[PDB]
């Protein structure tokens, strides 16, 4: 019984290992995506200030 339980516990441990690795991958991908998002936001902000200036004039 103990040896079978050991096999199953290692099974579960390895499954959680793999899932955590996949999650880290998705985390870094979303991280680079978020940086790109921030840059797009700043660009839009600058454009907005510019067009406001033009309209006032």
């Amino acid at each position: 019984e103990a040896e079978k339980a050991a096999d199953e516990s290692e099974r579960g441990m390895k499954v959680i290992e793999s899932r955590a690795q996949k999650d880290e991958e998705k985390m870094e991908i979303q991280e680079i995506q978020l940086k790109e998002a921030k840059h797009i936001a700043e660009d839009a902000d600058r454009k907005y200030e510019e067009v406001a200036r033009k309209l006032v004039i």
Partner: protein, 160 residues
């Protein structure tokens, strides 16, 4: 001029932190300062300064004088510090009015750009291409043939 040299000597460390942060953000390792004016503007907006888009345009059009992109941190740093606001409103309007009262030897409610030229001539200072023309051009900026009081204000407002 020598004012820029003095400002270099009086390097304010509080803004020096942000300027060296710009140094790090731009230079990704042994970089000889290729001058990414896009990165320059992003740094200027990021560091809390408020550069006008025309100021960033001037930065774009007044860099890479070497032709290789690599610009000495000395001249680039001078350009960055001078484009950064270092001034306290350029004196007071009351001072401006009193001094213009001093300058109204004509006693005609204003002064003359020719009178301005003669007064600065009395200073015994060198007048050159940088001097002479644009002095009278912008003193009587509206070009009335004489420097009005508000013209005198607009000539050197916000300058110490």
């Amino acid at each position: 001029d020598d004012i820029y040299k003095a400002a270099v000597e009086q390097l304010t460390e509080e803004q020096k932190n942000e300027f060296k942060a710009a140094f790090d953000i731009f230079v990704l390792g042994a970089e000889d300062g290729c001058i990414s004016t896009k990165e320059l503007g992003k740094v200027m907006r990021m560091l809390g300064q408020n550069p006008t888009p025309e100021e960033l345009q001037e930065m774009i059009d007044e860099v890479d004088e070497d032709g290789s992109g690599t610009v000495d941190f000395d001249e680039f740093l001078v350009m960055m510090v001078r484009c950064m606001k270092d001034d306290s409103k350029g004196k007071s309007e009351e001072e401006l009015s009193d001094l213009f009262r001093m300058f109204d030897k004509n006693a005609d409610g204003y002064i003359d750009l020719d009178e301005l030229k003669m007064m600065l001539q009395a200073t015994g200072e060198t007048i050159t291409e940088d001097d002479i023309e644009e002095l009278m051009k912008d003193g009587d900026k509206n070009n009335d043939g004489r420097i009005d009081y508000d013209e005198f204000l607009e000539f050197m407002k916000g300058v110490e």
